[PDB]
Each structure stands twice: as structure tokens, then as C-alpha cells.
Amino acid sequence: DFSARTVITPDPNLSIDQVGVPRSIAANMTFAEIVTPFNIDRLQELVRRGNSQYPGAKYIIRDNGDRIDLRFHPKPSDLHLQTGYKVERHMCDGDIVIFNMSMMGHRVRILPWSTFRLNLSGDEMNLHLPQSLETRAEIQELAMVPRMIIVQDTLTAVRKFTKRDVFLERGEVMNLLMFLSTWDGKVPQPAILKPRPLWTGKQIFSLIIPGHINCIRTHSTHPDDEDSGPYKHISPGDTKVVVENGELIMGILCKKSLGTSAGSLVHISYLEMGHDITRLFYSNIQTVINNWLLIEGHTIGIGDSIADSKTYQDIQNTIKKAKQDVIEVIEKAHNNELEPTPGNTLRQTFENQVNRILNDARDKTGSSAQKSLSEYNNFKSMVVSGAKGSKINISQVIAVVGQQNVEGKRIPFGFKHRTLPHFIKDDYGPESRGFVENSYLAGLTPTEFFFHAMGGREGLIDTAVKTAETGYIQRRLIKSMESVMVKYDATVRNSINQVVQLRYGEDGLAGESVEFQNLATLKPSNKAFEKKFRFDYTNERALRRTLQEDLVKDVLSNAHIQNELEREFERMREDREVLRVIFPTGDSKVVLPCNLLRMIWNAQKIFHINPRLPSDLHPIKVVEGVKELSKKLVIVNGDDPLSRQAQENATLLFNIHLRSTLCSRRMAEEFRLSGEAFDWLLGEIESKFNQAIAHPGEMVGALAAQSLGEPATQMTKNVTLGVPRLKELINISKKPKTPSLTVFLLGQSARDAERAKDILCRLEHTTLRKVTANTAIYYDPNPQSTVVAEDQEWVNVYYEMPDFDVARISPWLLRVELDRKHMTDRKLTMEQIAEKINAGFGDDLNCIFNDDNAEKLVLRIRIMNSDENKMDDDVFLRCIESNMLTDMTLQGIEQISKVYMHLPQTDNKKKIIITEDGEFKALQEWILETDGVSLMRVLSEKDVDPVRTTSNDIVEIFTVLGIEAVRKALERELYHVISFDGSYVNYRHLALLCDTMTCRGHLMAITRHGVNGTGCFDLLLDAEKCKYGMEIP
């Protein structure tokens, strides 16, 4: 029953799940309901109301299937209904509706006005009503908003609300607590009892936090040195967020702490409590903050944009300094003083230097503007909380708009060498080329306005096409993975029943319950790891402090316990080695199902564990308990060796992290958990992991497409990225835009710069055109003539030897000069060039080279004597001349235009090698990024790493390394573009896309059709269980 579309308006009072609908729309919509004795009267009254009154029924269906219209009401008897009938009663409060392939269900609430109401936390929409009860029950159980998951108007006020300055009087506190649904009914004790009660904002928000959840976060304006300083726990600026037993003890909340992220209050509550409790957390925050906002209030005005005169002078001074610096750079290029970089040309180098000066000025002036804003300033409040806007937006409003780049470059010369008629010809100044030195508040000059429009026009065009392209990818991905689903054997299979993945995400765990954490058994070196993990029972005094007197005696009484303690450490050390190969990059961050660190903290608070007193937990219990827990956690159930081997692989990281986090030393050194606390901890881990198992019947393929398509909208040496690369990755097209290849060097040359140049030259393809200066065809009657005067001195001595002079020689010549500068860069030699010409072309012609020490290099080429004795020699020389200047490769590999060599500052490119001490260290190794794909030949080159040398073109990798290597390469390219803008996507979703494409053994283009189901189990009735039961009537 599709409804009429209507505009959308916000409604903070309504819950996020609830949706507001007008009476008129609900009147047209009908919901068929089966009448039952328990609600026979309810249908009897509603049908009596009629269609004129809103709470009525459009039609009534009898058992035989006949539909009777209630508009007419011909007979009272026909109005009367019997049990088992179906009545199409009009939609009322409490009904479930579904609208925007993943759709979220909502609970309809009737409101007077016409426009729809949605508690966002505009565009028209049509809400669909599920008529059947079965799907209605299913929708409310899995498709509700709480299971699917804050406005910017609340996050900004939340940051102000949690500020230590905020103090609430008794009267104000009453109103805030009234809107709190999850309130125990008891007013908390004021923080400041005298001289007058004053509740802090955190105290009110403490009740908002549900249950007891512990998490540590940091405010956006958190100085780095503050954590290292002595005031780390007592934050001078309240920039550290800590929650204990569900109480916000300290810290100002913001998007980082309260907004959705890897670690946040909402995220922690979702895992700790669930979805239903989390929704109340959202509702309480929105309602309570809104009421308080009426007291504090949020606004914006000119005063925010008007900065102090001191900063204005600095901004203008920086702008003036930048403008003068640009002129100086222009003057240097005017007088030829500027020297181009070896990796760029003069024209491009000048554009780079000027861009940095202007770009740096905007950032420096913009940064000063951020510091200029006071705490009371409204502009600072928005950015500080991170709700809306950005530091760049304030910079363009206060300090400077910045350069207006068009098509990735400055304003082009639309006219003859001048951007606009007003500017002089061939003007490369700031104003002429579009540099906007005036902020929005100050006002732009007439020239700047047009340049600003040109920059804005490009963004609008890009935005218009970005949505069209990005939307196309979303539909294409869903179709190719619509049938992908997890079956009851914990395997991922499509409609054809082909195994895409043995286990979902290669682990068999859901992507929602997993939480980010960093196991600390790989980063520490061979000195810190042993001290922090290996239990030391030799120190009598230390054990007494850590363990009670009886425990110390027990461990030192029998050697059986001592052996187990050392054995547990050996397993951890063994786990340390396997992690290194698994994580060559050495990053500690990893995705795991349940967070042990948070769970341990919860146990400490639940049982009130204090580190002062000795821990009564037996260390042998930790190792024994962990051993039992590992067996209980099962991914591949079975007893066959394949299942046992798969089980270890599936839980390889979890067991390693579990043992490292839960060990004898840590449990008695820092965690200090008691015996009872550990027992509860083991049970919680087992329950959390069991709930983390991928439930069969989940459309992981559809989930992955949505998870991969959402970041695609926020996407948009020169390496193409964003939508253009994303299209080319799914579009297997043989010829990408910029198919670059990264070359990694090894050995001594990998460190030196000059030693890496020869590799650069031997990889880059150079032709005679790039090394030649000029060429001409001169005439010499006799061999000894040499009409050219300059070369007569050196040709004579060389020609004395009768080489190829046994017979007549044609009087033609093909003398060609070689550029001196180009030869030095390539380190070429005259003999090398001559050898290729003779060997490459054969014995058709003979070449003569001069001394290298000569300032000008002369290369004389004449047709071979044998061929001399139809283009005999004159026209042929013209033909051959063009050939050797176009398709002649003195040294290099074809399809390689240029090679970019530069030391990589990024850690990923840098080689990471385990040091002798143990701590990870990243050395500096030169990397040569080259345009084009020649992986087959580039890899088979001297002083080139055959392992780490990888290309960005999947097609090239397929023909060289195979389909299996493409799966990893495709993952890297997909992750590289997704992570370029800072967005992150779960690896399981990315792996699924690559596996499906490579499932058939060859690269498959994503289904271009892009047109765009719980049937793996059937419910069966049992007579034995039906023997018991009494009918309600």
C-alpha cells in the first residue's frame, strides 16, 4: 500500500524509531488484521466508526474472501463480524511502517499537521505498511532503527553542557530530569552542597548514561603534551573523558567521545548493553540537551566573524609577505635565476613554488584565526565540538578564502596569456591567477569574485557527476553480491551454491559486534615483553605484595605450578613469533570480536577490585581458566583434523590476544582481578564470542555492498584516486588512466641516492629524440672531403682505418648532434648509442662516433657499403631518420614514460625489519614509482626487489603473478582509495568483493546490469508439542 509522498520535518520529541504521519494519509492506508475473540470488540467499534471518521475500516473481508465496502453500510447485520475475518482497519498509533536494499522500520504516531515527522539523529518520502502479520513481526524484530544503528544541534550543546563551568540550580535540574525516561526517580546529591546546591552538567548526564559502562576518550582540543605531563589524570582543560560505573567523572563530550566512531559512548553501550538500551541513550541525550539549550542557548552573529585588530594585522602581514615572496619567485624566473628541480620542468616547477607560498599563507593565517576565537565565540564552539563546519570554513570567513584552483591548477589564461582583460599580458601574479586574499567577511574584489565563481563552478560540476557515478557503483555492487549469503555450515555461498568463502570474513564473526583493540604482545621488544609478561616467582617480596601470603607459599611449595607458569609464557613467546609474520607492518591496531580490556575494567568495578590489597586470584587458575576457555570457543565444530586445523586458524588472533591479555603476571601485577572476578570474566568472554558468531541467513553480500557504497560517495607523481580509480577497479578495463608501478630497491643501493639513479635510467625508456639536439643531411663528394669544417679534425683520424671503406661510399650523410645535458642525466656513452644503432638495425648502415671529451658530440651515420653496391640513399635516409628517433630504445623498457624517485616519508612504503632488540624499526629505502605497467620485465631487473615490488594495475598482476595475487592487490587498491580520505571499511566486506570477482579463477567485471531471501530454513509443525494447550476462548 504505497502512500502519497510528502515533505519531511524534524521532531526531537518523537523517538528515533517512531515516525509521525498525518491523519489524512493514515486514513487512506489500511492494515488488514485478523479478528480474534480477545479483540473482537476492538474491531466491532472501529468498523462502526465508518470511513467518515478517521478510526475506521476501508473494507471488511469474510472467510470466503468477499470484500464489503464500509462506505455504504447497507445493513447492520453485514457490519457485524465473525471470528476469523479480516478487517482493513485504518492505520493507528503503534503500527509498524517501513521506509528508506536495506530499509528501517518505524512506529507510526498520528499527528495533527500534514508533513511527516522524523526524529533525525526536507526530502519527500513514501512509507510502506506491511499488511501481513508475519512480515510485520519480522520487521519489528530485525529492521527497526535501534538495530540499524546525533544531530549537529545537540553535539554542540553537549560540549557546552559537559563543561565544568556549567552549573545547574535545583529548578533547572528538575526540568532536565523530567525528560529523562531512564531515571530511577531519585535526585542525585549535588556536587556543591553549600552555600547553595549546584548540580554539574556531568552529574545530570551521568544518569543519562545507561547501566555501568567504562570508556576513556579525549576531547578534540586535547594538547598532546598534557597526557605526558603530571596533570594527565587531572586535566587542566578537562580535555580527557573518563567514565566509571556509568558516571562521567570528567571530560567534555564531543563527536569524538559521543559521536559514532571506533570507540565512543554510544558504540560501547551498544556492545555492552544492546540496541534497545542504546536507543534510549540517544533519546535521553536529545531531549535533555534540548531543554537545557533553552537556558544556555546557541546562536551566531557578526561578532564571531569580527576578530581582534591584532590578528587582522598578522593576517594582512602574512598575506603581504606571501605576495612579496611570490613576486620574488616570479622575478627569479623572469631573470632565469630559478633552477628547475630534476623531477620537473621550469614552467611546472614555478607553478609548484607559487602554490606552496599561497597554500602555506592560508594555513598559517587560518591557524591563527582558530587561536583568535575566544571560548565564548560561537565559531569556536562548533569546530571544537566537531559537530558542523570545519577549521577551513572559518579560515575562509575570517583570515582568507585562499587560492581558487581550476581543474587542479590555478586560473588558466582564457585570453591571450592573461586571465582577465584588466590584468596585463603574461601576468602570473596572485590576483591575476585567482589568488583570493580577501575573506568572505571583508568582501572580495571584482576580479576575485569571478575567479571564485570559476572555482565553485568546478565543484558543482564535479558534485553533479560524482553523485551520478557513485550511485551507479552502489547498484552494480549489490547485484553482483545480492545472492551472496552465509549458509548454515558457516560458509559464504551464492545462489548457484558456489563457495565464495569458507568462513564469513575468514573468521566467522559478525562485522558489527567486533571492536577495535591493540594486543600488546608484538610491539614490545625482547626486553619489555619478558618483564611485562613472564611471571617472576623468585622475588619473595614482590609476590607477597601481589598475592596473599598463602598464595605465595602455594606457588613456591610445588614445582608443578612453577612449570605451568613458565609453560604459559612460552606459549605467549611462541604466539609472539607467529604474529610478526602475520603482521609485517607491525601495526598493533586490529579488529577482534570482544574487547578484553574494557571487560576487565567492568569486572574491576562490578566487584570493586582495588590494586592496593594483594590479589587472591591464583595465578595457576588464570592459565588453567584460559586453557578451558579456548576449547569452549569453537568456530569450526567437529573432530576431524581439517575442522581442528580450521578452528585454530579461525581463532588464531583471538587466542593469542586472549592469552596475552589474560596471563598470570598481568592478572597479579596490574589488573589485580580477584578469583570471583576472573570466573565472571571467563563467562562473559564465552557469551560475547558466541553472540559474535556470524548468524546463518545474513545477507553479507548486500551488507558489504552497502558498506562499500557508502564511503564511495565521500571519495571526491599523479595517481588517479576516488571515483575514477574505483570505477577502474571494478571495471577490469585493460588500459587504466595512470597505471603506475612502485619499484622497491634492495641492498646497498636502496640507501644511497646516486646508486639508485642508474636503476632509474635502466628502467625509464629513452629514445634518440630525447638525447639528440639537431640533425642534418649533408653532402660530401669524396670520403675525405668532409665539407663540415668543425668535424673535419676528428673524422680524419677515425676514418684513416679503412673500416667499411673497401669499396665506394655514397656521398650522403646523416650527421646528428647529441645534447650534452641529456647525456649526463642518463649517464650514456657514445659507444653505447652507436652499438644499439648498429645492432638494433643490423648491417644496413654504419655509424661513427667522436670523442666523449668534446664539448659537442657528433654522430655521423651512413648507409652500409654492402647495400650501396626506389629511395636509393637520399629518400631512404629521411625515412630511416624518423624511425630511429621514434621507435629506438637505447636503454629502458617500453611503456615507461618517466620514473619518480623520492624517499618515502610514509611508513607503509618504508621497509619494516625486526631489529636485534625486538622493537620494530622502519629504515629509509629509496622507492622508484614509475608510470606504466612493465611488472613482468621490471621485476626481472638487477637491484630490484622481487618481493615488495608491486603494481597498482590488477590486470598486469593477473598475467604475471596470477589471480591469487590479484586478490591481495585488489584489496590494497580498494583499501588505498577508501583510506585516502580517512574513511575506513571492515576488511571482511572488502575481502568478500575480491573473492566474488576472483571466485571463477579469472578477473570478472562487476555486473553492469545494476537492476537492484530467508529461505535456507523452513518451519515445521510438530504434533507431539501440540498435545498440550488450551484454547483462549
Binding site: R503, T959, I963
Partner: protein, 209 residues
């Protein structure tokens, strides 16, 4: 260039010897990590324009499980490989009564000669390898995971546990460089133990078809 040829031939020999070891044949320890300095010493002369040629580069190895399953690695020693030379090699192999042999073909191969590998009798198994391909070891590449060939006994047990069919398992082309490196044919399942970031280790099985 004679000096360039020494490295080019040395890499082929080093990769070829490692190819047999990965396949499952008995290979001497010294021949796997044999150094370039020893490449010239054990030949005693420069390959190009010298006594050391490609004909004597032929190596003989025996399968670890059974010594009677020897393997051959022949070198055409010519810019292009024709039918006549191919017929000689298998005819030469007939005397030794061997079932598998490897041909290290140069960059150019006669299209007619390619048909020789298709019309050969089922007991004939000739695998072509370009000179450029063998200059680098594909297996050692970081992107390429560890590949292990699954025996017939394991395949039947594997399907029984997972209740899978040949078509359901992921497919891999027979012409893949990794498949050619292991010399696997249709109906063979390759165990891929890749270092998955999520679970650490993830074993995947692909059927050649």
C-alpha cells in the same frame, strides 16, 4: 652482453631448481641456495661464446615419494623452438622412460610448435615456460600466498567434511603462473594458506578448471 647472460642464466637455474623443490621433487640443498659466484666456478667458463651452453644446463631430479618418477628440464638452445626439435626431446626422453619434462623456451615460440603440447599422448606431459617468466620466483612474492597441492586422498576427505562439490569450490585457471609453476592440471585442488589480517591464517582450496 656476456656478463648480463651470466645473471640471466643463473636466475633461471636457481628458479628452476626451486621449482622442483616446491613441486615435491628431491633437490640437493646446495643447488637451491647456489650462489652466483659458484655459477661460473662450477661451469668454469662464460656461457656466451664459451663451452657452457644451455644443452648441458639440463638437470635431473627424482620425486621424493618414489625415485622412479624423475623429471626433466630441457633447454632448446635456439632463438625459436620448432616442431622438429620438440619431437627430438620427447624421443630422447623415451629412452629414459620418463613421463614429465620441462622446456625453458625463449621469448619466441613457433605457433605450430605450440600444437605439439596439445596433440601429445596423455602420458606425455610437456609444460612450456618462457625465459622471462622463470627469471623471478613467483612463489616468494609477498602478494602470492603459500600454495600446497592437495593429494587425491585429501580431496575426497575435504569434500566429505564440508559436503562440497567440484563446481562449488572456487575455480582457478590452468594457465595461471602459479598453476604453471606447480605444474597442476584439471581436477587438482590447491591449498592456499594465506595470512588473513582478521583471523591471522585462512586456508582456501581452489580447483583447477
Amino acid at each position: 652482453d656476456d656478463e648480463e647472460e651470466t645473471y640471466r642464466l643463473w636466475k633461471i637455474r636457481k628458479t628452476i631448481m626451486q621449482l622442483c623443490h616446491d613441486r615435491g621433487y628431491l633437490v640437493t640443498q646446495d643447488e637451491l641456495d647456489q650462489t652466483l659466484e659458484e655459477f661460473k666456478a662450477q661451469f668454469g667458463d662464460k656461457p656466451s661464446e664459451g663451452r657452457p651452453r644451455r644443452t648441458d644446463l639440463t638437470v635431473l631430479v627424482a620425486h621424493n615419494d618414489d625415485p622412479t618418477d624423475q623429471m626433466f628440464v630441457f633447454f632448446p638452445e635456439e632463438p625459436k623452438v620448432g616442431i622438429k626439435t620438440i619431437k627430438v626431446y620427447c624421443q630422447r626422453m623415451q629412452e629414459e622412460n620418463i613421463t614429465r619434462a620441462l622446456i625453458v623456451v625463449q621469448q619466441g615460440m613457433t605457433p605450430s610448435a605450440k600444437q605439439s603440447l596439445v596433440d601429445m599422448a596423455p602420458k606425455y606431459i610437456l609444460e612450456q615456460f618462457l625465459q622471462q617468466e622463470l627469471l623471478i620466483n613467483i612463489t616468494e612474492h609477498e602478494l602470492v600466498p603459500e600454495h600446497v597441492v592437495m593429494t587425491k586422498e585429501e580431496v575426497t576427505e575435504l569434500l566429505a567434511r564440508y559436503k562440497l562439490r567440484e563446481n562449488q569450490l572456487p575455480r582457478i585457471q590452468a594457465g595461471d603462473p602459479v598453476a604453471r609453476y606447480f605444474g597442476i592440471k584439471r581436477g587438482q585442488v590447491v591449498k592456499i594458506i594465506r595470512p588473513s589480517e582478521t583471523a591471522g591464517r585462512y586456508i582456501t582450496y581452489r580447483l583447477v578448471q
